[PDB]
Structure 1
C-alpha cells in the first residue's frame, strides 16, 4: 500500500538556487510513454 506525506507549499521563492542549462534536443515519444533521442 502506497501512502502520501506533505512536503511543502507550491510557491515561487525569490532568491532560489539558479542552475541547469537549456538544451534543444530532437526526441521521439513511443506508445509506452518513453522518450528517446533522435540524432
Structure 2
C-alpha cells in the first residue's frame, strides 16, 4: 500500500540557490511516455 505525507508549501523563496544550465534539445516522445534524443 502506498501513502502520502505532507512535505511543505508550494511557495517561491526569494534567496534560492540558482544552478543548472539551459540546454535546447531535439527529443522524441514514444507511446510509453519515454523521451529520446533525436540528434
TM-score by length of structure 1 reads 0.96
- What is the RMSD computed on CA atoms of the aligned residues? 0.4
Q: Can you give the 5+ residue segments of structure 2 that lack an aligned partner in the other structure?
A: none
Runs of 4+ aligned residues of structure 1 deviating over 2 Å after TM superposition are none
Residues paired across the two proteins, number: 39
Q: Deviations over 1:1-28 (max 9, x none)?
A: 0000100000000010100000000000
Task: Give, in whole Å, the separation in 2 of the partners of 1:5 and 1:37.
Answer: 35
Structure 1 gaps, min length 5: none
Using structure 2 for the length normalisation, give the TM-score: 0.96
